[PDB]
Amino acid sequence: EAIVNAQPKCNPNLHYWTTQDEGAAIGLAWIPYFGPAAEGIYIEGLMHNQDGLICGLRQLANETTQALQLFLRATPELRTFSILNRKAIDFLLQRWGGTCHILGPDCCIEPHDLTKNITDKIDQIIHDFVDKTLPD
Amino acid sequence: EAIVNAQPKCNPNLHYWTTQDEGAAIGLAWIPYFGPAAEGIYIEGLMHNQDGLICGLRQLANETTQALQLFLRATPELRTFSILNRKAIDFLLQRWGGTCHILGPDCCIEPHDLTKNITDKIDQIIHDFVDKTLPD
Amino acid sequence: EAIVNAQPKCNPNLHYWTTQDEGAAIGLAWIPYFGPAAEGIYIEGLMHNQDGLICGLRQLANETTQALQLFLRATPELRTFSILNRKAIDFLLQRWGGTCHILGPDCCIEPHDLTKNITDKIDQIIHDFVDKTLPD
Amino acid sequence: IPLGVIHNSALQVSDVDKLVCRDKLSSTNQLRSVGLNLEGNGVATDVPSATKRWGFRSGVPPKVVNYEAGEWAENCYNLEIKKPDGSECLPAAPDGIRGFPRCRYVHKVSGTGPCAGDFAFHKEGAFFLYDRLASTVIYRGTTFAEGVVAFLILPQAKKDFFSSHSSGYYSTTIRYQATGFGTNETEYLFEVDNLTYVQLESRFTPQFLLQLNETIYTSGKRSNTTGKLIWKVNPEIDTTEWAFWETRSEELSFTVXXXXXX
Amino acid sequence: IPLGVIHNSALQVSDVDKLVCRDKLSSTNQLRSVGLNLEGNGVATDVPSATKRWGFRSGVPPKVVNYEAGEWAENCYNLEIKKPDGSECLPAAPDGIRGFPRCRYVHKVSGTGPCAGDFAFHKEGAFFLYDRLASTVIYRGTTFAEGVVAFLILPQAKKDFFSSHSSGYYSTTIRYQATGFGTNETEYLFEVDNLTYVQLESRFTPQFLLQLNETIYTSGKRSNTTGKLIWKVNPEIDTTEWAFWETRSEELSFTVXXXXXX
Amino acid sequence: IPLGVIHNSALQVSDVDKLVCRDKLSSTNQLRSVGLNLEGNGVATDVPSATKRWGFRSGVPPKVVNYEAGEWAENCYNLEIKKPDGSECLPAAPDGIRGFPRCRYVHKVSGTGPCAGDFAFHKEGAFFLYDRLASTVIYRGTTFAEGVVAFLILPQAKKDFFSSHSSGYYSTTIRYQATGFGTNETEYLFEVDNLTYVQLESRFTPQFLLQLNETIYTSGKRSNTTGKLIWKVNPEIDTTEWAFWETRSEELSFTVXXXXXX
Ligand SMILES: *[C@@H]1O[C@H](CO)[C@@H](O[C@@H]2O[C@H](CO)[C@@H](O[C@@H]3O[C@H](CO[C@H]4O[C@H](CO)[C@@H](O)[C@H](O[C@H]5O[C@H](CO)[C@@H](O)[C@H](O)[C@@H]5O)[C@@H]4O)[C@@H](O)[C@H](O[C@H]4O[C@H](CO)[C@@H](O)[C@H](O)[C@@H]4O)[C@@H]3O)[C@H](O)[C@H]2NC(C)=O)[C@H](O)[C@H]1NC(C)=O
Ligand SMILES: *[C@@H]1O[C@H](CO)[C@@H](O[C@@H]2O[C@H](CO)[C@@H](O[C@@H]3O[C@H](CO[C@H]4O[C@H](CO)[C@@H](O)[C@H](O[C@H]5O[C@H](CO)[C@@H](O)[C@H](O)[C@@H]5O)[C@@H]4O)[C@@H](O)[C@H](O[C@H]4O[C@H](CO)[C@@H](O)[C@H](O)[C@@H]4O)[C@@H]3O)[C@H](O)[C@H]2NC(C)=O)[C@H](O)[C@H]1NC(C)=O
Ligand SMILES: *[C@@H]1O[C@H](CO)[C@@H](O[C@@H]2O[C@H](CO)[C@@H](O[C@@H]3O[C@H](CO[C@H]4O[C@H](CO)[C@@H](O)[C@H](O[C@H]5O[C@H](CO)[C@@H](O)[C@H](O)[C@@H]5O)[C@@H]4O)[C@@H](O)[C@H](O[C@H]4O[C@H](CO)[C@@H](O)[C@H](O)[C@@H]4O)[C@@H]3O)[C@H](O)[C@H]2NC(C)=O)[C@H](O)[C@H]1NC(C)=O
Ligand SMILES: *[C@@H]1O[C@H](CO)[C@@H](O[C@@H]2O[C@H](CO)[C@@H](O)[C@H](O)[C@H]2NC(C)=O)[C@H](O)[C@H]1NC(C)=O
Ligand SMILES: *[C@@H]1O[C@H](CO)[C@@H](O[C@@H]2O[C@H](CO)[C@@H](O)[C@H](O)[C@H]2NC(C)=O)[C@H](O)[C@H]1NC(C)=O
Ligand SMILES: *[C@@H]1O[C@H](CO)[C@@H](O[C@@H]2O[C@H](CO)[C@@H](O)[C@H](O)[C@H]2NC(C)=O)[C@H](O)[C@H]1NC(C)=O
Ligand SMILES: *[C@@H]1O[C@H](CO)[C@@H](O)[C@H](O)[C@H]1NC(C)=O
Ligand SMILES: *[C@@H]1O[C@H](CO)[C@@H](O)[C@H](O)[C@H]1NC(C)=O
Ligand SMILES: *[C@@H]1O[C@H](CO)[C@@H](O)[C@H](O)[C@H]1NC(C)=O
Ligand SMILES: *[C@@H]1O[C@H](CO)[C@@H](O)[C@H](O)[C@H]1NC(C)=O
Ligand SMILES: *[C@@H]1O[C@H](CO)[C@@H](O)[C@H](O)[C@H]1NC(C)=O
Ligand SMILES: *[C@@H]1O[C@H](CO)[C@@H](O)[C@H](O)[C@H]1NC(C)=O
């Protein structure tokens, strides 16, 4: 399933606001007593429709909402933050939550560098450990 | 440790209620304005004692409660949801939270398909790369 | 980056309090109706500056606070518990959140026990599967 | 907190020190929190026997834990208790805390008690089950069930247990009064109407309380006065200890506030 | 809840049953919750068209969800509605719930309505966006935007999208009154001062409301009396359906509480 | 948020860009949040020096973070401050917020101040430590300690640090009054009884405040009148800057509300 925008319009430029968690503020900004007030904790940016992301996103958000709204009904948590962390767990679980059969369709293990460094161990012992008939 | 029911009785049929998080409701149900009210968000089912699960479960829940109650004392979170997600993390951590020594007692890596596809590489080079003495 | 204490003083003995989550209380303690009241749920210990941990810790906590305080501004969660679990996820993600190339700089896979048990398979077939020219 | 897993066709508590790779947790949807009602272990579900398992205590703060799926209950309770001097005894349901969603009979107790304590806990270490929240305490006027929570990992053969895959939900409030609530010396009366109370005993089952409601109503024994009629029943109806999932009255009464008989 | 991922230079919904190892989630910082305003899909942003998408309903409890980054908005709303008999219609903003941080025009509606319901929901299944919290309901006197939340995984080529790497933030409250709020039969007036209301129509854009404010003020049509002057505009100014990101008044008025014209 | 790890027999901040597989996190129990008191870095613990590090501010909302284990404290504070016109200056402790569990001396300050602000923050970027919760602000009448939180990963050699493996907990409230609280121009008096205040200076240690309590009591200098007696001490007792963990009065007084000396 790919995403096709079926909205009346798509505003293809996304002006956004968010919050910097940086760790590296001017020198005292970070102390809350001296800190910016609620209204100016924000950073801003502008992202264009390169690769069609903004139109994609608007439609995705639309699409999402039922699936979300239903999930929200189901929980008695008043304000739900866990969602993302919870996704990231399922992410690891879906790859690592069970024996990983090397070279299976569903294993993330890449043994290519290994097997090179085992074919290079045998080519060694065809030149000396096979050199049993030719002595001195 | 297995679980033995030491209750006065065990009602071996579990009628249950829960909530569907589905994602696929009739078409407008999912909108909360039109949605079922608090009393009818539920689904129901019935599970029998096949493999002794219901009697198992009742006793398990009993057994659990001390271990839980103690945990609840210890946290100053008023309503504790994290419990399950937290279990699932320890699950991954206990298998993946440290170098996985292939073929160790505590590694989930199955290299059987690999090693077949390395014994099949050598049987190849006993028929041609060893064919150095017989020419043309 | 290591940690150097630049405080006026460092009290190098840490008397501490915390809570036992044990699971194994005297026999009724664990029932909250009979339980210790809020003031006596605690355990205590004393840790010395062995390996310089206490002075380390005091400075670390100091150092931490900006990075933390900033993070706290950024979230609209009133009381933030997720922090630790969230760290533990990033921990797994940073090692397992992507194909693990065996023997790469960033793979936690130790194949040493494997490759021994493949060099011991070839030394077998130099003594019999190579024994094609000498019959009976 | 111990975790159920199914090994060798039987549920067991899984042990951390050596969990093993055959086990498979592919998603979070494999973990479930399940709330089992205390009835199902065959505790007495009657109002005076139930109440004996609860007490007031102070200096322990309340804690709430979420569970995902609950048992249909036969018996629930809904307490509104005042101290003698009009004061509220049970704290208001905090925001988000709803009565247990599936009860057959809701024992709605009104009355007064000494209430020597801030909060009301379960004496046996059990929980008050509300709507997908378990609490350590009773909230005022909010339907609950007694029970206990378990956590398990389903195998992905059975991942849809509880989650996915109905002759209908039927409920009935049963009013009561009581004095001396929470001591060893408590009096309960069962309400038929405003002024028509029936003196209450342990052995009386809900079904029979409903037929007694149907007999006083039907046969006209409801107090026509504007004084409190306090009926009583003869100790001449017998049952001889049968749990509710396992598997009718022809008497009359004589008159004597108005502490009669039957 | 479906998750965006970028494959083949295009965003798509990722499907669980066969996600694939080339995909790479190295940290939590790669996951984002993003709140897009409904304007950007080109719904009508005017006050009577906006209001038509909201209704009162009871027995559905409110739920709140956090998102990390929001769109700069053109249009937001701030409702203080009373029922006719002085009663509050919208519940107070719970602790931590702030108005949407970036609005160009805040449509501050005061008025009265029937309000047949406990809470006010979005009829189309959308959310009220506040400060990094989305809610299912409207809170009293708290600025919001209509919109929707998406979740995605950024590739670590683009992990810093939204997070890291400014001609300034300019705002303007627009007061209104209204009667019959939430029915099909509602009257809105736009406030210039205490007693100088203008009758309101759909087609009127904020810019033009501000120039109308600038015309009544400037040209002295503000009621000098101490009665309510209710202006009106001629249907003789035209626009012929142009969204706001895509890309001036010489009339006067005649007099007739004081339901005049222009 | 930086994370402690033990490498080469020394604690260091671990760096994300190249954490390495020898490191081993086997469970969540290996991560700890630890709350260290500011005393232990040797800030002045006296009431007027402590107070100088706090101020009122508005437009910053409060935030709370949980930690798992705290230092036994020598000095804590418990503020109940009113503005001059009887109004409450500090917000009530929210539900779940308890005073710091282990304090030797609780400096209970009552008084009045200008309080030019919604909430009271720590000026140096530190936290108010309560019971397993750190907050950015002071709550009314709730015991706290100043300090800071660190996070670490224990190696599983040491996983039981803090967690698992006692001559007893002894506490003493010390009452004070103060005027002009939170400015540079504030007056503190130390309470012995209702009307027997002692004028307060920086250099006075708790021990010596307790012996001064033991001297005025013992030797009968408690005001027998029903006016406020305001004692003072001679500047003739010396100490010459010794922290509290490192390692007794024969004078009398002359009389002069009743601003005496000693
Ligand atoms: C998990 O599952 C177990 C098993 O059901 C529960 O065990 C119960 O624990 C509580 C303690 O918290 C017990 O309450 C006490 O019971 C005794 C006597 O009880 C008698 O009557 C019972 C009702 O029919 C009956 O089941 C009992 O039968 C068994 O026990 C006796 C030994 O007592 C034995 O001889 C029998 O052969 C049976 O095996 C018994 O005849 C009662 O005296 C206690 O009261 C005193 O102590 C309390 C303090 O706890 C105090 O408040 C009182 O005022 C008084 O001083 C107490 O009420 C209960 O009997 C147990 N049930 C069983 C079957 O053992 C446990 O609660 C479950 N946990 C949870 C969290 O649900
Ligand atoms: C995700 O994105 C989709 C697409 O934009 C949103 O789809 C909208 O869904 C809501 C339902 O919740 C629709 O509201 C209803 O609309 C009909 C008629 O609408 C007319 O006017 C619109 C405004 O300009 C216009 O867009 C419509 O044009 C399309 O639809 C018609 C078919 O109706 C079609 O013939 C056209 O060619 C267009 O494709 C249309 O002309 C209205 O009659 C409904 O009212 C009745 O039903 C409701 C119950 O829902 C009831 O309360 C009323 O009183 C009345 O009985 C209803 O209001 C809206 O039209 C849809 N928009 C589009 C473009 O399809 C969806 O909401 C988004 N989801 C979220 C969560 O934001
Ligand atoms: C982490 O650990 C560090 C180190 O302890 C803490 O550093 C402290 O930061 C605060 C700023 O938030 C400082 O407060 C200011 O201090 C100056 C002068 O302080 C003097 O008196 C101190 C008390 O004994 C003393 O420690 C100082 O000694 C050092 O500093 C000077 C330079 O000032 C140097 O010359 C010395 O040789 C020492 O190295 C010093 O003599 C004071 O003037 C400031 O007040 C002004 O500014 C504030 C705004 O911040 C304003 O509100 C005032 O009204 C005024 O205008 C200010 O109070 C403190 O001195 C620092 N301590 C040290 C030892 O450096 C830091 O707080 C810790 N973080 C946390 C989160 O706990
Ligand atoms: C006791 O029984 C009577 C009837 O047998 C109940 O009163 C009936 O209540 C129902 C439901 O509201 C009505 O449809 C009937 O008209 C009533 N019948 C009579 C004969 O009054 C009464 O509600 C029952 N009380 C309790 C406590 O269960
Ligand atoms: C309507 O316009 C007038 C001015 O054109 C506004 O009143 C001005 O408000 C500003 C900002 O506070 C002042 O600096 C000016 O002195 C005012 N000018 C006059 C001519 O009164 C008024 O605030 C506007 N009203 C609305 C609803 O936007
Ligand atoms: C000041 O000291 C006196 C006693 O030295 C304290 O009053 C004593 O308080 C204790 C504990 O409640 C009692 O057992 C004694 O009987 C009291 N003795 C006398 C001589 O009154 C007083 O509480 C102390 N005050 C402060 C502020 O610490
Ligand atoms: C292959 O593995 C061996 C381990 O025995 C290692 O020392 C060697 O350097 C590897 N070869 C190459 C080319 O990296
Ligand atoms: C074994 O590995 C090689 C990789 O060089 C692969 O192409 C080949 O198909 C594998 N053999 C079988 C039988 O799958
Ligand atoms: C090596 O692997 C084989 C699997 O075919 C196993 O049975 C054998 O015991 C291993 N050798 C040793 C020495 O462990
Ligand atoms: C009791 O009487 C009141 C009016 O006095 C009436 O409204 C109510 O329904 C009656 N309750 C019962 C249970 O009969
Ligand atoms: C309305 O009048 C009041 C005083 O009667 C004044 O304070 C207020 O600013 C006026 N509001 C407007 C919008 O003109
Ligand atoms: C102050 O006097 C009141 C009664 O007037 C008394 O109850 C209280 O204990 C006294 N407080 C102190 C600290 O002496």
Residue numbers in the entry:
A (entry chain B), B (entry chain B), C (entry chain B): 502 to 637
D (entry chain A), E (entry chain A), F (entry chain A): 33 to 197, 210 to 284, 287 to 293, 302 to 310, 471 to 476
Paper text:
Next, the T577P mutation (P2) was incorporated into the GPΔmuc-WL2-foldon construct, resulting in a new design named GPΔmuc-WL2P2-foldon. Unexpectedly, two transition peaks were observed in the thermogram, one registered at a lower Tm of 61.6 °C and the other at a higher Tm of 68.2 °C (left). To understand how the HR2 stalk and HR1C mutations affect EBOV GP, we determined crystal structures for the unliganded GPΔmuc-foldon with WL2 and WL2P2 at 2.3 and 3.2 Å, respectively. WL2P2 yielded a more complete structure than WL2 at the glycan cap (R302-V310) and HR2 stalk (I627-D637). In the WL2P2 structure, the glycan cap covers the RBS with glycan moieties visible for N238/N257/N268 in GP1 and N563 in GP2. The WL2P2 structure also provides an explanation for the higher trimer yield (i.e. the formation of more favorable inter-protomer hydrogen bonds), although the cause of the two-peak thermogram remains unclear.
Ebola virus (EBOV) glycoprotein (GP) can be recognized by neutralizing antibodies (NAbs) and is the main target for vaccine design. EBOV GP contains a heavily glycosylated mucin-like domain (MLD) that shields the glycan cap and neutralizing epitopes in GP1 and GP2.
